[PDB]
Amino acid sequence: FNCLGMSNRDFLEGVSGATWVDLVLEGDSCVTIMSKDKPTIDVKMMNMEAANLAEVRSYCYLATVSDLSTKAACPTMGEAHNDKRADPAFVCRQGVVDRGWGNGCGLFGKGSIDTCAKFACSTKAIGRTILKENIKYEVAIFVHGPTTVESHGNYSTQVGATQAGRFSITPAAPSYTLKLGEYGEVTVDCEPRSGIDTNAYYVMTVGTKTFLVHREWFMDLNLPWSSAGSTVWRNRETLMEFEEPHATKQSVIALGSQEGALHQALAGAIPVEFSSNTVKLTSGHLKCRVKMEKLQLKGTTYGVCSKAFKFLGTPADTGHGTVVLELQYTGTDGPCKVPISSVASLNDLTPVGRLVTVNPFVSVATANAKVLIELEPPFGDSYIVVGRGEQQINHHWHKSGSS
């Protein structure tokens, strides 16, 4: 729910001298936003789901053929019409058979014949569309308030500390305002109608396994089908074989499962987990404007930490040109502001990078408080310095790269 630790991280600054920022979020990816006099926040794309899809087609894969009748008519007695023909559920084929003495007619010629049998669908396969209305994006936001190596990740700890927050965004409610305790609030205005069209490639469930299938291919499947809101099965003949016409009894059977031929014709297609009527999505992005007018800094009245700090390990490189490190304070002088910055040479009176953990704080009155800091040191050699004069400590950093 936090940027720290992700490869997929971006850095943004609010337009010099304005409050809001435009971004576009991407799957499993994170954005750290920095504004003069406001705390740093992280916006992150937790999850993007299409739920409650529309059922497009439906396709039968194993069928049953039942109650076979066949009406027969002697030569010159005209065309036989099996009465089962009035039945929506039955399926019928006219034919022609040699008849005569040897088999029931008083004349020799081609007698008529008409065969009906009932069609049932054992199991089926459903294709579904991803209309854009079905999309929900889930966004976490995190304020860079006092945090610890231990606690920076602990999602619960942050929520408790009025510091994290998970909300969703959908065309139904494209906007949200997350209140963040005394940090004020951040409002988000997004525009979900991004990436996916209303009618491309379908989602098709064959028994257990659900697939991302070529739309066009699904429509041409040579199987029986029922549309959206009805179980009437059209184009059934594809799964039933009508055998040789025996004068008395013609045989009508079902073809066995097609399940195998399908998992086969999809061996290569993109598999999707469709548990509980929703679909994880890996593509997709969201445009938002993130308004920070009402995001405030908190406790600027507090004094600067008067006592000595300590480094708790070599500062570590995040791999985005920023460093993370963890102080440990020694004093007990209430909560106070941490005197950390980055200077080009040790005696330097003004600083050189920027803090990412803007406005860092010892937030307790007990001894040995820890604070995590992430800062962006400048290119080349510099010292990270914490403290004033006698109690100053420091650590050197080189950052490679020119531009």
Ligand X SMILES: *[C@@H]1O[C@H](CO[C@H]2O[C@@H](C)[C@@H](O)[C@@H](O)[C@@H]2O)[C@@H](O[C@@H]2O[C@H](CO)[C@@H](O)[C@H](O)[C@H]2NC(C)=O)[C@H](O)[C@H]1NC(C)=O
Residues 176-235 that bind ligand X (CB under 6 A): none
CB of 147 to ligand X, least distance (A): 12
CB of 160 to ligand X, least distance (A): 9
Per the CB < 8 A criterion, the answer to whether 72 and 158 are in contact is no
Per the CB < 8 A criterion, the answer to whether 384 and 315 are in contact is yes
How far apart CA 64 and CA 214 sit, in angstroms, is 28
Interaction of residue 366 with ligand X, rule CB under 6 A: no
CB of 312 to ligand X, least distance (A): 15
Q: Which residue is nearest to ligand X (CB)?
A: 154
How far apart CA 396 and CA 131 sit, in angstroms, is 54
CB of 164 to ligand X, least distance (A): 12
H helices of 92-154, in order, are: none
Q: Pattern 119-158, binding to ligand X, x per CB under 6 A?
A: -------------------------------x---x-xx-
How far apart CA 190 and CA 178 sit, in angstroms, is 14
Q: Pattern 153-182, binding to ligand X, x per CB under 6 A?
A: -x-xx-------------------------
CB of 162 to ligand X, least distance (A): 15
Q: How far is CA 44 from CA 93, 140, 168, 184, in A?
A: 62, 5, 11, 19
CB of 37 to ligand X, least distance (A): 30
CB of 156 to ligand X, least distance (A): 5
Give phi and psi for 353, each to the nearest 5.
-95, -135
Minimum CB distance to ligand X smaller for 208 or for 366: 366
Interaction of residue 276 with ligand X, rule CB under 6 A: no
Interaction of residue 328 with ligand X, rule CB under 6 A: no
Minimum CB distance to ligand X smaller for 153 or for 195: 153
Nearest of 56, 14, 58 to residue 32 by alpha carbon:
14
Minimum CB distance to ligand X smaller for 156 or for 231: 156
Distance of CA 392 to the CA centre of its chain: 48
Per the CB < 8 A criterion, the answer to whether 113 and 97 are in contact is yes
Minimum CB distance to ligand X smaller for 326 or for 376: 326
Minimum CB distance to ligand X smaller for 156 or for 275: 156
- Number of chain positions touching ligand X (CB under 6 A): 4
Minimum CB distance to ligand X smaller for 163 or for 341: 163
Residue type, 285: H
CB of 25 to ligand X, least distance (A): 24
Minimum CB distance to ligand X smaller for 156 or for 400: 156
Minimum CB distance to ligand X smaller for 156 or for 282: 156
Residues in the chain after which the chain is broken, C→N over 2.5 Å: none
Please give the sequence-ordered ranges of beta strands (E in DSSP) within 243-400, or none if there are none. 252-254, 270-272, 278-280, 285-291, 309-311, 316-317, 323-329, 336-337, 340-343, 354-355, 361-362, 370-376, 380-386, 393-399
Q: Which residues bind ligand X (CB under 6 A)?
A: 150, 154, 156-157
